[PDB]
Structure 1
Amino acid sequence: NRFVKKNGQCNVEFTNMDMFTTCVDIRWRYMLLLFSLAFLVSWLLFGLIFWLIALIHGDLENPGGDDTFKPCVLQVNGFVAAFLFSIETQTTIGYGFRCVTEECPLAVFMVVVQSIVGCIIDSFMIGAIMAKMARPKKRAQTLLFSHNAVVAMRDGKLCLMWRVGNLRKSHLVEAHVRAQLIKPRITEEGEYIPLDQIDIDVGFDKGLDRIFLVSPITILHEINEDSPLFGISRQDLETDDFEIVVILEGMVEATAMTTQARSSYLASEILWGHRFEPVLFEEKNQYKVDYSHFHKTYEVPSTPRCSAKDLVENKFLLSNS
């Protein structure tokens, strides 16, 4: 039946899976203690001002006032009371026992000031809990490479292969693969490149490196005249110092945040003359993917042990003679 329903939906089911710009990430909870401190500082500061004012105006000795005398702020009898009024103003709780009066302009202006300050402050609190909210780090890896890469024969050509798959049913828009052989080398003129990155060809020029990934795919590198692996046999493989890097880029269907997935195979991690265990099965009305067979491989004794280079050379001696 259908691999892709007419609406784009996929027919597969997955089984058996195991300046201050730095302030956005500024801290885990240290920002919370930071803001709690921000408040405390502002509350204590304005309380001291209100207490200074009540002290000077002489309210401390007549906090409630009377017919002849009106406090700047009612009911401030000390610094503790002062502290309270400041809080109630900024928090805008405003119980009202401590209350401003029309007497002192300085006091009124001070409330006016404290109100704006207070607003700005928690306004920023929402911004910091915005930044730190969505600006992640450590996004779960949705993509997977076979633990090993395989060298075997497919359709007459000798090929290095490895597997990639999505752990999520979510699609990868504009996905493409790359590979490089990495190793030190010395140029013809005797120049030293400590680690050289040599492209390994997955089909870029025809755009076959463009992939549609639903179920796990085996990526093919034909080893040929233009391959850095052209002169390598199965024995060389248990010798050589080279390492292969593999990449899969693309964009998460939901985010449109381009992703780059990486992994590596040492010469020692490449299994010659093997093949991957099929991960995809058809059961009646729909397709299943058994993810336990992902890394699993099996020997193909009929696989030639020599290098692709000698493989091709031999062909012509069986031609010429």
Structure 2
Amino acid sequence: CRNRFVKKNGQCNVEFTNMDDWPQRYIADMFTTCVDIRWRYMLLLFSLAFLVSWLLFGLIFWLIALIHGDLENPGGDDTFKPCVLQVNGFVAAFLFSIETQTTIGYGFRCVTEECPLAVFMVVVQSIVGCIIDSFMIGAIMAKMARPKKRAQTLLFSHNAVVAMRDGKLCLMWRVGNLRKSHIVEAHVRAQLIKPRITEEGEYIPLDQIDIDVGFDKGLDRIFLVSPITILHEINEDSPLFGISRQDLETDDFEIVVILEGMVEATAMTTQARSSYLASEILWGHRFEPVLFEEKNQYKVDYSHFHKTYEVPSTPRCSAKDLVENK
């Protein structure tokens, strides 16, 4: 009923306001800012950087030509050599600047030995060009390689389920890899999200309470080839210990699930997230299998990935009742 902290696709559902000093901080952390903005604006920013550098140096070569008399004798002759051949106006100056900085250098417009200032500006523009190119290459390479995109080829089940396994009542969900390339050093986390009032009267708008999936024995670390069903044993230390089927069907909470690991090609950590509201957890269900053996290999049928089937033998009471009654 209460709206969700993170959406089914992993997007977090929180807006930040009154962050009054954000412009100064985003400027101080400019690179992060640059790679976070969408492609349109980042490429526009670098376009502007090129345009502005080309125009500035264009203006300088035009002024050098103006003062030297080159606009009146752009090709030169036996008794007059221009600072830069064929700068006859602002457009030609702009072209020479572009041709120099891009290093295209068609050469109709061409610096001469005559003016030390012109030679110096070609030196400076060349160095500046290399600097700007380096910034652009770096920004583009970083934005290209962003590992959050890998979450698009990782899959959480639409539902979580509650069912008995090896004598214990467990909360379960499924994760899968949609590529042949791996997620290295892969590991899973989960949290129960809900508001809470402490015994001292402190209101916590959204508390984040750990859902144990094996950390203490390193069993949170998974080797993900075929889809794996992640298990949370509901025992005396679980926050779901006193939750029966009926409680679940009239409760208001959210289970956030996280898969973290490194994109194999780049070794860069991605964080894939999803969320199960109380109403999206199916008590007394198990996932249909997807893995089956063939002649010389195994195969995964992903069309059954999200499918569940009901298990009538599943206890309807809480895990606490299971121990209390026994």
Could you state the TM-score of these two structures normalised by the residue count of structure 2? 0.73
Alpha carbons of structure 1 residues 224 and 37: separation in structure 2 relative to 1, 3 Å: closer
Please tell me whether the aligned partners of residues 10 and 274 of structure 2 are also in contact (alpha carbons under 8 angstroms): no
The answer for the alignment partner of 2:94 in structure 1 is 83
Deviation (angstroms), 1:57: 4.4
Deviation (angstroms), 1:266: 2.0
Say which of 311, 319, 326 aligns to 1:308.
319
Deviation (angstroms), 1:290: 0.9
Deviation (angstroms), 1:235: 1.6
Compare 62-71 and 244-253 and name the one that shifted more: 62-71
Deviation (angstroms), 1:307: 2.1
Partners of 1:265 and 1:82 lie apart in 2 by: 63
Please tell me whether the aligned partners of residues 59 and 93 of structure 2 are also in contact (alpha carbons under 8 angstroms): yes
The CA RMSD measured in Å over matched residues stands at: 9.8
Summarize the alignment of residues 1-321 of structure 1 with structure 2, pairs less than 5 Å apart: 19=30, 22-25=33-36, 28-30=39-41, 32=43, 34-61=45-72, 68-73=79-84, 78-79=89-90, 82-83=93-94, 90=101, 102-118=113-129, 120-122=131-133, 124-134=135-145, 138-315=149-326
Alpha carbons of structure 1 residues 240 and 24: separation in structure 2 relative to 1, 3 Å: closer
Please tell me whether the aligned partners of residues 174 and 227 of structure 2 are also in contact (alpha carbons under 8 angstroms): yes
Please tell me whether the aligned partners of residues 185 and 195 of structure 1 are also in contact (alpha carbons under 8 angstroms): yes
- The runs of 5 or more residues in structure 1 that have no matched partner are 316-321
Please tell me whether the aligned partners of residues 190 and 212 of structure 2 are also in contact (alpha carbons under 8 angstroms): yes
More helix by percentage: 2
Partners of 1:169 and 1:2 lie apart in 2 by: 32
- The runs of 5 or more residues in structure 2 that have no matched partner are 20-28
Identity fraction in percent: 100
Alpha carbons of structure 1 residues 251 and 98: separation in structure 2 relative to 1, 3 Å: closer
Alpha carbons of structure 1 residues 251 and 311: separation in structure 2 relative to 1, 3 Å: same
Please tell me whether the aligned partners of residues 168 and 234 of structure 2 are also in contact (alpha carbons under 8 angstroms): yes
Please tell me whether the aligned partners of residues 13 and 289 of structure 1 are also in contact (alpha carbons under 8 angstroms): no
Aligned length: 315
Please tell me whether the aligned partners of residues 8 and 275 of structure 2 are also in contact (alpha carbons under 8 angstroms): no
Deviation (angstroms), 1:96: 5.3
Alpha carbons of structure 1 residues 256 and 133: separation in structure 2 relative to 1, 3 Å: closer
Deviation (angstroms), 1:262: 2.0
Alpha carbons of structure 1 residues 3 and 155: separation in structure 2 relative to 1, 3 Å: farther
Partners of 2:294 and 2:119 lie apart in 1 by: 78
Please tell me whether the aligned partners of residues 152 and 273 of structure 1 are also in contact (alpha carbons under 8 angstroms): yes
Partners of 1:8 and 1:85 lie apart in 2 by: 50
In our comparison, the structure showing a higher alpha carbon Rg is 1
Alpha carbons of structure 1 residues 124 and 270: separation in structure 2 relative to 1, 3 Å: closer
Partners of 1:175 and 1:167 lie apart in 2 by: 14
